[PDB]
UniProtKB/Swiss-Prot annotation:
Keywords: Allosteric enzyme, ATP-binding, Cell membrane, Cytoplasm, Host cell receptor for virus entry, Host-virus interaction, Hydrolase, Membrane, Metal-binding, Metalloprotease, Nucleotide-binding, Protease, Receptor, Secreted, Zinc. ATP-binding induces a conformation change. Its cofactor is Zn(2+). This is Insulin-degrading enzyme. The lineage of its organism: Eukaryota, Metazoa, Chordata, Craniata, Vertebrata.
Length: 954
């Protein structure tokens, strides 16, 4: 075969991985991985081009990102602007892409029966894209919103600020997103033909030698091979040299520098950065991760422990951070308490003290050995990935590793390299340090402005006196290396499937205190389990004050277990613990071996909790800011939030919570906890590598612990009250209007309430949503370009449902309203004009999506958990609902549109949330809308309306 340059030897995989693999290099240089999974419901492909933003023309920032957007909008073989989206949508698929500095990564999934058609359309992106003039003029606005959305976001600002403070000559300094100015206005002004620059760029850099492809399907490896050779060997090889960046963006003049930065949110952070060489080639020893593991440790003896005890920091991140081919960074990032903010010099001294400890002890093979063993176990028992993410991830790493090692390369450690460890450790020195402090206290004291985001900051030399103090850091006896991790699992035995084992969770305990749902894993056979618990107390959400206290309690509890639980975390045993409107939620996930130990500790801790006053005051202060910082969330997020407040029976606002927070004292909190625990109901799902007897024991152990230490008594069934959704009146339209003070975009959510969830009402809604899904995106974004964010689909809450539209835009909400209304009328015509085959395609597409099997335990657990917390308990829901779905007709959907959704629908139930921005033809005809009732007060609104029933259990 002349189209294939070489075929891969065995691709190393986990012995638990039933998927089949073959690696190839095509004659044109494309590295390929083929994955055969005859069980998969969705097939997938991805292609990664080893070119990105760092290669943008200096005079056209964002070109490669723009290019990425434009490949979706038509090729020579498939010139219809949305043929790709529409094909994927009509075949249960989805696509996306991303542009980073050195990569452009495209990926899709689709129903397994339609891989070839999806893959063919896809391949044309890399052969002959149209870069249509009309589409270019429109899509540039979507890139502009993407950017607009990021501008007042603290992370993006910091991201670009770093680039702005290094060598300006370095490609690292480039603005990667682009916007209307960089991609249209300035280029027109400078006489540039952007369509030619896209063609020029595609031609020069989209070369086969820089591409890697991954394809996953039901087909055999042989069949997948022919397929890929067929569609991809015509991609042209231009032998483009791979861009490299051997010169660090941070040279001498950029070291021993301090940056004082004003955030948008009220946050307090410190970023310590060291420039380091490119460690990528050392992947078999991974010295930077060895050091990140230690410097970032959260257990006893760690840097974070001492910083916490001193009341200076709460969280810490440490380790290596990617740059590009040629350079990397090493970082230590902490948040700051109000004291911490006054002690940055000391915090940083402690950092250099801990680093000095590492020099003193030298490289530790036992530490390396441990990281190795953990990674080995993690790889062996890796959860089976969803195809779309998997092809994308592997396509990226086909560029860095031999074909035979792509699956293992990022997991298995091979080499102990004390030499490389000392080499990197030698870079972590004060003379090589960069320091950034983010705090509102710098407000008004800054003299520089980063140009792309507007970030206010100040730059100073770190004084030599301060550098010297850091350089002479003695050994602090508070810092000890971590000890052996006792949570490392050793028992991976898969218990044989019991005789009375069930396909769905079975109710195996139904007492006044406990409802225990159980299922032994019959699918995945990895030594793991998920243990989920809902704790109900009417006292977790009875008022704002108690809602605050439930939160602080659990935050305090997690803060207190952190040192102990960290070992468990590294050993693949994690837990999740948060307060809810009904109670408390606890999830323990991971290797089942040491699980009961961690679970017992959490419950013991809950029931015998002693609060540290210093920890209390600090966490309370952070929570204060956290509530306040909601003002800086995105407009569309505000819209969703306000709607959730409006449609739920009981809901405390951020203002209400914040106001009540000043009244939370230590005495009150101490009194609250035993009250909260005094009466409970526990509903649990125990699912995985466990038996009925172990499950009964785990459950009973949780109860017995609560009973012994907290004297927990049962709740009454009548107390187990779920909240209802507000029942909107026939033909009603309500508008609630608010302003976002931070962002200069508007947000809108439109909710067309339909009826109670129900087999029939569920599938009417879901099928209509399926049909309008792609056209809504194509119409409201691609054509009309209202915003980057355009979403439509079902909304489900409290047993009720309806259709929702969410948009974030530069246009005012009342304008968005008419365009969404104009769009609905178009869909009605579209359903009338659509063929029977086209209609059945949509039924078939939704069917595939609903019946898509979970590939890992947690995904299956999640399905059940939904059935359980919604109190609907409909475990066979998918087969049932798909069967009903298949009997539906074009006529049925049209009747449902006319009765519930159309503008003059007799049972239209419409509520709109308008979030105004900070400073506030060729188009289809929008219908005239009625005068809306403007909601002035959320409480009056709820009082004046009925409440829906709750859904009856299955
Ligand atoms: Zn984008």
């Amino acid at each position: 075969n002349p189209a294939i340059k070489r075929i891969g030897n065995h691709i190393t995989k986990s012995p638990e991985d039933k998927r089949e693999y073959r690696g190839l290099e095509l004659a044109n240089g494309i590295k390929v991985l083929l994955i055969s999974d005859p069980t998969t419901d969705k097939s997938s492909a991805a292609l990664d081009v080893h070119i990105g933003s760092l290669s943008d023309p200096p005079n056209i920032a964002g070109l490669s990102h723009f290019l990425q957007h434009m490949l979706f909008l038509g090729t020579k073989k498939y010139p219809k602007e949305n043929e790709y989206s529409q094909f994927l949508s009509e075949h249960a698929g989805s696509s996306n892409a991303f542009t980073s500095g050195e990569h452009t990564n495209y990926y899709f999934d689709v129903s397994h029966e339609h891989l070839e058609g999806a893959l063919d359309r896809f391949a044309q992106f890399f052969l002959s894209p149209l870069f249509d003039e009309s589409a270019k003029d429109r899509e540039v606005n979507a890139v502009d919103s993407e950017h607009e959305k990021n501008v007042m976001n603290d992370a993006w600002r910091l991201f670009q600020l770093e680039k702005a403070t290094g060598n300006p000559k370095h490609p690292f300094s480039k603005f990667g997103t682009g916007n209307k100015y960089t991609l249209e206005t300035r280029p027109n002004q400078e006489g540039i033909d952007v369509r030619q620059e896209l063609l020029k760029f595609h031609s020069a850099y989209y070369s086969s030698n820089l591409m890697a492809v991954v394809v996953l399907g039901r087909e055999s490896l042989d069949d997948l091979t022919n397929l890929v050779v067929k569609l991809f060997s015509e991609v042209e090889n231009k032998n483009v040299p791979l861009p490299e960046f051997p010169e660090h963006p941070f040279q001498e003049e950029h070291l021993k520098q301090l940056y004082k930065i004003v955030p948008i949110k009220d946050i307090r952070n410190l970023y310590v950065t060291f420039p380091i060489p490119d460690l990528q080639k050392y992947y078999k020893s991974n010295p930077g991760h060895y050091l990140g593991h230690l410097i970032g440790h959260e257990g006893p003896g760690s840097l974070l422990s001492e910083l916490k005890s001193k009341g200076w920091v709460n969280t810490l991140v440490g380790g290596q951070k990617e740059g590009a081919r040629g350079f990397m960074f090493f970082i230590i990032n902490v948040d700051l308490t109000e004291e911490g903010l006054l002690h940055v010099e000391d915090i940083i001294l402690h950092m250099f003290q801990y680093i000095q400890k590492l020099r003193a002890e030298g490289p530790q093979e036992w530490v390396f050995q441990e990281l190795k063993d953990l990674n080995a176990v993690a790889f062996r028992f890796k959860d089976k990935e969803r195809p779309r993410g998997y092809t994308s991830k592997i396509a990226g790493i086909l560029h860095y590793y031999p074909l035979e090692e792509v699956l293992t390369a990022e997991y298995l450690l091979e080499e102990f390299r004390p030499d490389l460890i000392e080499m990197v450790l030698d870079k972590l020195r004060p003379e090589n340090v960069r320091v950034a402090i983010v705090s509102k206290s710098f407000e008004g004291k800054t003299d520089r402005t980063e140009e792309w985001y507007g970030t206010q900051y100040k730059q100073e030399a770190i004084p030599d006196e301060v550098i010297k103090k850091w350089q002479n850091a003695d050994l602090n006896g508070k810092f000890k290396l971590p000890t052996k991790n006792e949570f490392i699992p050793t028992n991976f035995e898969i218990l044989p499937l019991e005789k009375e084992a069930t396909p769905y969770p079975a109710l195996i305990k139904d007492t006044a205190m406990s409802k225990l749902w159980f299922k032994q894993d019959d699918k995945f056979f990895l030594p793991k389990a998920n243990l989920n618990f809902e704790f109900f107390s009417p006292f977790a959400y009875v008022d704002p004050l108690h809602s605050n206290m439930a939160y602080l309690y659990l935050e305090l509890l997690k803060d207190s277990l952190n040192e102990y639980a960290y070992a468990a975390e590294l050993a693949g045993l994690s837990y999740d613990l948060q307060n809810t409107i009904y109670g408390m939620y606890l999830s323990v996930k991971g290797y089942n071996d040491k699980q009961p130990i961690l679970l017992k500790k959490i419950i013991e801790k809950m029931a015998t909790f002693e609060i540290d006053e210093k920890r209390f005051e600090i966490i309370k202060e952070a929570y204060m800011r956290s509530l306040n910082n909601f003002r800086a969330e995105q407009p569309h997020q505000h819209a969703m939030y306000y709607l959730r407040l409006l449609m739920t029976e009981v809901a405390w606002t951020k203002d209400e919570l914040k106001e009540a927070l000043d009244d939370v004292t230590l005495p009150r909190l101490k009194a609250f906890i035993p009250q909260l625990l005094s009466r409970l109901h526990i509903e649990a799902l125990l699912h995985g590598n466990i038996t009925k007897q172990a499950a009964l024991g785990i459950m009973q152990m949780v109860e017995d612990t609560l009973i012994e230490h907290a004297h927990t008594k049962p709740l009454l069934p009548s107390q187990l009250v779920r909240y209802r959704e507000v029942q909107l009146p026939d033909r009603g339209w309500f508008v609630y209007q608010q302003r976002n003070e931070v962002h200069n975009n508007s947000g809108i959510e439109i909710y067309y309430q339909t009826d109670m969830q129900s087999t029939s009402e569920n599938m009417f809604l879901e099928l209509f949503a399926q049909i309008i899904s792609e056209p809504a995106f194509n119409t409201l974004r691609t054509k009309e370009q209202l915003g980057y964010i355009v979403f439509s689909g079902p909304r489900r809450a409290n047993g009720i449902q309806g259709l929702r539209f969410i948009i974030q835009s530069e246009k005012p909400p009342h304008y968005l309203e008419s365009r969404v209304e104009a769009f609905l009328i178009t869909m009605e015509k579209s359903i009338e004009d659509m063929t029977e085959e086209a209609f059945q395609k949509h039924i078939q597409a939704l069917a595939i999506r609903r019946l898509d099997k979970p590939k890992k335990l947690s995904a299956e657990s999640a399905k059940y958990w939904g059935e359980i917390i919604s109190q609907q308990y409909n475990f066979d829901r998918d087969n049932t609902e798909v069967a009903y779905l298949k009997t539906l007709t074009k006529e049925d959907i049209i009747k449902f549109y006319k009765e519930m959704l159309a503008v003059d629908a007799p049972r239209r139930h419409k509520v709109s949330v308008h979030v105004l921005a900070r400073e506030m033809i060729n188009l289809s005809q929008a219908p005239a809308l009625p005068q809306p009732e403007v909601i002035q007060n959320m409480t009056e609104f709820k009082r004046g309306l009925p409440l829906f029933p709750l859904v009856k259990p299955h």
